[PDB]
Amino acid sequence: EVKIMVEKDPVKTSFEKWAKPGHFSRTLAKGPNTTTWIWNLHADAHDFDSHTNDLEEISRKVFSAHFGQLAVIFIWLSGMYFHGARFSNYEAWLSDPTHIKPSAQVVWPIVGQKILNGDVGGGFQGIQITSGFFQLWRASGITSELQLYTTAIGGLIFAALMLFAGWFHYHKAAPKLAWFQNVESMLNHHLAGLLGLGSLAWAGHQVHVSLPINRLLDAGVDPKEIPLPHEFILNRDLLAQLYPSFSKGLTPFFTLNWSEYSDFLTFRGGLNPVTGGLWLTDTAHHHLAIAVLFLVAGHMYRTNFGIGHSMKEILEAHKGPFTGEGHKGLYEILTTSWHAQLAINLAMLGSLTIIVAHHMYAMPPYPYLATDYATQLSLFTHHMWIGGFLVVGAAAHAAIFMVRDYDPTTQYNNLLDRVLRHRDAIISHLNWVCIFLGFHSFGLYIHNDTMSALGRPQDMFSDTAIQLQPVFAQWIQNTHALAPSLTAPNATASTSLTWGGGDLVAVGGKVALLPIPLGTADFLVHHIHAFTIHVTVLILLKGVLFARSSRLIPDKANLGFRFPCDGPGRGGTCQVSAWDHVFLGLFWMYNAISVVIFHFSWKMQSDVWGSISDQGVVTHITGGNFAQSSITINGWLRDFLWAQASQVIQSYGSSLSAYGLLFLGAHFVWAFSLMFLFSGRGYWQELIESIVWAHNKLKVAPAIQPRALSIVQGRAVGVAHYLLGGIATTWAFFLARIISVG
């Protein structure tokens, strides 16, 4: 029966364990014999499963840690709003959003770093921000810095509230295991009460605050004399003169004459020509509809009033001849293992973030977002990287579950067992498809390189050569361009300006969006993307499926999840642990996301982003050379890496010099990672022995014996520095280039 269950005062609030560093584990609670202990102290701090076998205590730790993360995020958001309130030119940007660069960070005049306070416009000097917060606040109807201040104060209050909630739910009233295992109630509340009610509330804000303020802004009204939101809520005649349907006043809602709300609940599609963003009427209708859908969907599961679904009975009822018991035993897996839930949720969150990245540039939801090329590029790249990291983490935690939380006795002839039983076939076919994709994409690039170098441009794979047209994607674009005509008759515009139709939105003198063409280069780059994704999936899935055992080491589950090797026997067992598979999948996700963001940047600078003149001539940032230069690896090296890097390396002496500094520093960090990746551990241990001799000669040798990093730690440091260097190099390069050319 679904009920509230807590324990009073489980843990005493005391600083006694603060003085003891490794209190959470029996091994580290003894003391630091060696320096490795310190690293171990930071590598097992949040591994709550390793601290104890009690699932209740692990659940309580997880809940309180989530509260702490929420408090941290609240502090971060409050900081952003504070910096918008004081150290920003938000109001000047409101007065003129097309010619003033957003800025919300101001440096101190200490060591000549004051040069970084560039002339962003509006009588302000500071760092040009690319987070899109200005456009988000413009969409929300924020017109003054006082509103940002009150938002920041509320954010601090909420951070303190979350911090107190974590303390209360760990040390004062800690929920019991039965409370955490109520997955049906949790889903009902998070669907109806979290997503549905949140969407409804945001629709209310939009209807009452965003639409009137933003339509007055689109009309050219100076934000100073735009009436405040509460004046729209109170003086409803002032709101009705913008949208007459408000004069009806909730009568159409309850009489089901909903068409009378067509003034502010539209299904237009496309972009607002004035701002280049989505119509906020469409957004309000969207949020209302999804709120209704989520509130309906959150009434699906049976908590204690009958009427509903038992997910255990749903799962046990889904089985077939090609499988065994089907989805039998998965309810226990997902209600008794935190790592399985973390894997599922991480995979979904990463894929969702990638969807967000793809959908926020094709439909810019904020005003003056598309024409802010720097913000668009930054948002796309940021969310791509976040999604990739989350997917790799999902793989890691699936492997952790398979190693530690997997119980063969309760999993017999179900789906997990059967997947484990034909992993050889799965990995064989995935390896074959990876090889085939790698060949028929990168070998096509190499073919193009060779024929271009041999003076045989007619033997290449291009539009003026052997053509590989993406006919399926082109057909999908054609279908989506004609959707309002026949397939969605109640639509004014198509889903996005990227499908087709010959419509070009040009806020100011720039280009917001236009029909994106697909040719041989797009065919090639999408197949490169598919190749990289399949190879990453190969590495990660092979790590997960072979985590427990393999033909080499049949007892790999006893070895654990995070172990270096099993020895130099059987020819060498280096990197047989699933942790090492995640370690390599990080490199492959890095390559995949890097190529994805490079393709986005080049395609947008070449075919979409640009400036339109009064006559109507559209010139692009690069000049439309993607169709003929992206087909060749030399073209990528020259027309993208060499041509577009001219600004990061020439940024010295200007406000973009920090980008060049961090460009070179990220190069440095990557090269530094290379030695943790290439070197071993015995060499460094012996070098440390020599250094320890030098220290002992002078009676300055520490009692905490210096040790070289473990093998797994060496790999972790190498991959961390590698990813940091590469990603920061790209970050500096994109930001400098897109701030210079935009």
């Binding site: 009489t255 089901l256 909903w258 309906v296 009434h299 009033f305 009958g306 009427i307 009822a317």
Partner: protein
């Protein structure tokens, strides 16, 4: 508005759903549906004054679903005719 087609449709939908739930023609708190769509009896634990076993939660569920279906029918008939 009482004699309007929207009112008639909504009243009919809600009444039909309540009748189906009360008289064992639809799932309820004490009427579980199996995988074969056969209705079996269960002890929801909610005591009600209804002799048949119609609870307040059953009434709320049937009314909500009846309103959902009635809104669907009303808007569909408006869009088509």
């Amino acid at each position: 508005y009482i004699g309007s087609s929207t009112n008639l449709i909504m009243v009919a939908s809600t009444t039909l759903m309540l009748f189906a739930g009360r008289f064992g023609l639809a799932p309820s708190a004490n009427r579980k549906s199996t995988a074969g769509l056969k209705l079996v009896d269960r002890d929801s634990g909610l005591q009600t004054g209804d002799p048949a076993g119609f609870t307040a939660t059953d009434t709320l569920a049937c009314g909500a679903l009846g309103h959902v279906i009635g809104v669907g029918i009303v808007l569909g008939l408006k869009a088509t005719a």
